[PDB]
A paper describes a structure:
Using the full [name] [name]-domain structure as a guide, N-terminal [name] truncations were generated to obtain crystals of a dimeric [name]/[name] assembly, encompassing the full predicted [name] domain of [name] (S. cer. residues 251–812) and residues 228–496 of [name]. The structure of the dimeric [name]/[name] complex was solved at 3.5 Å resolution using Se-Met SAD. As expected, the [name] domain of [name] shares the basic architecture of the fold but with a more elaborate helical domain that extends over 450 residues. The helical domain can be subdivided into two regions: helical-element 1 (HE-1) is composed of helices 1–7, whereas helical element 2 (HE-2) contains helices 9–13. HE-1 and HE-2 form TPR-like right-handed superhelices similar to those found in other [name] proteins, with the relative orientations of HE-1 and HE-2 defined by helix 8, which disrupts the helical repeat at the HE-1/HE-2 interface, inducing an almost 90° bend in the domain. An extensive, conserved protein segment formed by a 40 amino acid insertion between helices 13 and 17 meanders back into the HE-1/HE-2 interface to further stabilize the kink. The dimerization interface between [name] and [name] involves two distinct interaction regions. Helix 23 in the WHD of [name] engages the WHD of [name] in an arrangement similar to the Thp1-Sac3 [name]-dimer (Ellisdon et al., 2012). The second interaction interface between [name] and [name] involves a loop between helices 18 and 19 of [name] that engages a cleft formed by helices 11, 12, and 15 of [name], allowing a stacking interaction between residue F664 of [name] and Y257 of [name]. This interaction induces a rearrangement of up to 3 Å at the end of [name] helix 15 to accommodate the [name] loop.
Eukaryotic translation initiation requires the recruitment of the large, multiprotein eIF3 complex to the 40S ribosomal subunit. EIF3 is a large and structurally complex molecular assembly that, in the majority of eukaryotes, consists of 11–13 subunits ([name]-eIF3m) with a molecular weight of 600–800 kDa. We present X-ray structures of all major components of the minimal, six-subunit [name] eIF3 core. Yeast eIF3 engages 40S in a clamp-like manner, fully encircling 40S to position key initiation factors on opposite ends of the mRNA channel, providing a platform for the recruitment, assembly, and regulation of the translation initiation machinery.
Author numbering:
A (entry chain C): 251 to 794
B (entry chain A): 225 to 495
């Protein structure tokens, strides 16, 4: 007894002294676990053993794979002991006292959250240091893949610790307070993945858990259902609206919109966003959650584009994609490059916690090509109109846009066959201008980014169509000067657009732009060249 | 220091030379161009001038880069400057001399027509700093400088001189068609021809367009397409030909109106 208490206390006191050998401090605690038999001895040993490790490796870049792997063993062992104890270590409820032997530490304080809450924090360290490894490893080395293999095992501990918290805690006000955070971590480890990969992590997490079950969702029974995953997400989602921390509520809402905008229909997501009412909020809630909001904005900008809504897409992305620094604003930047910048390390934790690991990255080239394809289909006919002599619809002046980069490509001394993706998009634009839609589609299919979409064929043909339409428009706009008359049959055949579309587009456009053009539906023929802007000025001079 | 200076300059120059050649062989045209700038300015600074092998390979690269650039004149020039250097090499086969002279003459033919003015500043002009050219040696000037030179005209394949006769010796539309029928069969036999079909075709068809605008000023479209149509290698879809004309028209070579209601094209010149 008193041997054990006196040892342990001597160690804890010696730890609060500056010069210490942390290797020897760890090895001593362990060699004194060897002696311990009684359970309070074990638990009180581990409770100061885990942070003793984390503290030992604390001032490094991260704790290496071996020390992390053994500290996991520690937390799992304390958990196995607390599990085999089954809450009976506290002498039930009516009698709280931890008494044996509280006199030796003398520093005990009544609580559950106080003594048994610290547990969660331990788990969190395992996770946090873990992330610090994924940031600091080489993105493409196999090591990164191995670390990511460890992610699953952390998710395990999240679920297990959750379940022990459910069995132990008898006060719902405390149980909620305790559960909010591991629900949060649990969410962070799910939403960016596919329903499959998530149900893998979940299944794998449930297989390592024994006869202990208390949970609201009741997954052990319902594991195989297809409504499983969705109900988990919306479950923890609805839970986190209870908690009073605003960053937590917005966090939750944003995880919802992300997951949903991936594995569910776009309209649901849009509804969620406009109903959720976070605007003046997001600006003041610091960096990481803004990274999250920009991530979900990107995601709905992406799925809306998968739906082949161009008008919607360009609406969604313009604010965030006008940013020069967008790569940083999405929280993706190599840690190293800003690790030299941010030093000293004390305040470097701040900027380094802001960037994200690789598997959570949204490829920027995909996003940029997407938005630029949009800004193309949108801005090209209106431009063609304007500079070939019709300006009724034009007052865009376009910030950081496809048009400006057109103006800068025209001014180059050298014009090379396209290599960078913006050049392929470019060639597609000029192709539209001259009226070869085939060429434009060809140049657009040479872009690599389209391969990251699981629906790629569908959007290939969908885009081929929307491009057929807009390029028909553009053609008409540019060439109406030298053509007095047109044939809907020929035009229809050559653009590969059925006449119903042709007459519709052309008529609608001429009616919207007030163009001096006349269509006979009966013979399917069109007429122009009357004029003008200047001729209306001739007329205005003549009347008065 | 001047020794270490001269050596380091030489190192850096050769370095850029192979950055150019590797880039071109690796199909990176921007790094190629940028490195070529780097070469030009270096030689301007350099005291010791390059070894002939490196310059020959330099033009050997420049010809490709200016091919894909869309500027036929620079292409032609660097291709000439490859000739002038290659006549000095001990292994020179008559087949090769013939091939290259031929190709030079073709690139002169393929050239877009410089006669109709370009309003505004052409950025491409800056590139001419690179080849010593102060301004563009108009398609005329190219034809002259080529036939003027002994070896060049001398080694050209007969089919191509014949082509130059088809196009530039009293060209009449139908007769040019008939001449092209026979001559293309004899012409396409030879290796060099593969690459020049498109710009050549466009030049021919431009000539056709202007001659048609002069000879008859109001016509049915179906009557125009027959004249505009060319033989086998130059064949084009109907609307493609329509747009070749469109090109020529927007280029302000011919001022045109078209009424398709009656399937008519009207050429009116009221200058």
């Amino acid at each position: 007894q008193e041997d054990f208490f006196t040892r342990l206390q001597t160690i804890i006191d010696s730890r609060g002294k500056k010069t210490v050998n942390q290797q020897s401090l760890i090895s001593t605690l362990e060699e004194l676990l060897t002696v311990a038999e009684k359970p309070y001895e074990f638990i009180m040993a581990y409770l100061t053993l885990i942070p003793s490790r984390f503290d030992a490796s604390a001032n490094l870049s991260y704790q290496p794979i071996d020390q992390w792997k053994s500290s996991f063993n520690d937390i799992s062992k304390l958990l196995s002991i607390l599990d085999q104890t089954i809450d009976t270590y506290q002498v039930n409820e009516f009698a709280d006292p931890i008494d044996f032997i509280e006199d030796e530490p003398k520093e005990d304080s009544d609580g559950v959250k106080r003594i048994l809450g610290s547990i969660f924090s331990f788990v969190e360290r395992l996770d946090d240091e873990f992330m610090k490894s994924l940031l600091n490893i080489d993105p493409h080395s196999s090591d990164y893949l191995i670390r990511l293999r460890d992610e699953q095992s952390i998710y395990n501990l999240i679920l297990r610790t959750q379940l022990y918290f459910e069995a132990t805690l008898k006060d719902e006000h405390d149980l909620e307070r305790a559960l909010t955070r591991p629900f949060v971590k649990r969410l962070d480890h799910i939403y960016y993945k596919s329903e499959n990969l998530i149900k893998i992590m979940e299944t794998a997490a449930w297989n390592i858990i024994p006869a202990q079950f208390k949970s609201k969702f009741t997954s052990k029974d319902q594991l195989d259902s297809a409504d499983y995953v969705d109900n988990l997400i919306d479950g923890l989602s609805t839970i986190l609206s209870k908690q009073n921390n605003i960053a937590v509520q917005k966090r939750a809402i944003l995880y919802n919109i992300y997951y949903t905008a991936l594995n569910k229909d776009f309209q649901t997501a849009k509804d969620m966003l406009l109903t959720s009412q976070v605007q003046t909020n997001i600006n003041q809630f610091d960096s990481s959650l803004q990274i999250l909001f920009n991530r979900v904005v990107v995601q709905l900008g992406l799925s809306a584009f998968k739906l082949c809504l161009i008008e919607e897409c360009h609406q969604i992305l313009n604010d965030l994609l006008s940013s020069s620094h967008l790569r940083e604003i999405l929280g993706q930047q190599s840690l190293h490059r800003i690790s030299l910048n941010s030093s000293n390390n004390a305040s470097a934790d701040e900027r380094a916690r802001q960037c994200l690991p690789y598997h959570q990255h949204i490829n920027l080239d995909l996003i940029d090509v997407v938005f630029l394809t949009c800004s193309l289909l949108i801005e090209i006919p209106r431009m063609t109109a304007f500079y070939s002599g019709i300006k009724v619809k034009r007052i865009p002046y376009s910030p950081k846009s496809i048009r400006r980069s057109l103006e800068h490509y025209d001014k180059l001394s050298f014009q090379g066959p396209p290599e960078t993706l913006r050049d392929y998009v470019l060639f597609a634009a000029k192709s539209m201008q001259k009226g070869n839609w085939r060429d434009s589609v060809k140049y657009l299919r040479e872009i690599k980014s389209w391969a990251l979409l699981p629906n790629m064929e569908t959007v290939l043909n969908s885009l081929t169509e929307r491009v057929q339409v807009e390029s028909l428009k553009t053609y008409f706009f540019s060439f109406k000067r030298f053509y007095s008359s047109f044939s809907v049959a020929k035009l229809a055949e050559l653009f590969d657009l059925p006449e119903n579309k042709v007459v519709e587009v052309l008529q609608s456009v001429i009616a919207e732009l007030e163009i001096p053009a006349k269509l006979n539906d009966e013979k399917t023929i069109f007429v122009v060249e009357k004029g003008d802007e200047i001729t209306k000025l001739e007329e205005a001079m003549v009347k008065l | 220091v001047d020794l270490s200076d001269a050596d380091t300059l030489q190192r850096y120059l050769d370095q850029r030379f192979q950055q150019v050649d590797v880039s071109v062989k690796l199909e990176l045209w921007h790094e190629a161009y940028r490195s070529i700038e780097d070469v030009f300015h270096l030689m301007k600074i350099s005291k010791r001038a390059p070894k002939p092998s490196t310059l020959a390979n330099y033009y050997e690269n420049l010809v490709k880069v200016f091919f894909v650039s869309g500027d036929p004149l620079l292409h032609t020039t660097a291709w000439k400057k490859f000739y002038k250097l290659y006549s000095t090499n001990p292994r020179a086969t008559e087949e090769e001399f013939k091939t290259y002279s031929s190709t030079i003459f073709l690139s002169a033919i393929s050239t877009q027509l410089d006669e109709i003015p370009s309003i505004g500043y052409d950025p491409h002009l800056r590139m001419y700093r690179l080849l010593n050219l102060d301004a563009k040696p108009t398609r005329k000037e190219m034809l002259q400088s080529i036939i003027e030179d002994e070896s060049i005209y001398g080694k050209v394949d007969e089919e191509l001189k014949e082509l130059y006769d088809i196009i530039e010796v009293n060209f009449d539309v139908d007769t040019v068609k008939q001449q092209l029928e026979n001559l293309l069969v004899k012409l396409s036999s030879k290796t060099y021809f593969s690459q020049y079909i498109a710009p050549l075709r466009d030049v021919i068809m431009r000539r056709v367009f202007v001659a048609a605008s002069q000879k008859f000023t109001t016509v049915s479209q179906s009557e125009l397409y027959k004249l505009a149509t060319l033989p086998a290698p130059l064949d084009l879809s109907a609307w493609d030909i329509e747009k070749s004309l469109l090109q020529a028209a927007v280029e302000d070579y011919v001022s045109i109106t078209i009424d398709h209601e009656s399937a008519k094209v009207t050429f009116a010149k009221d200058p």
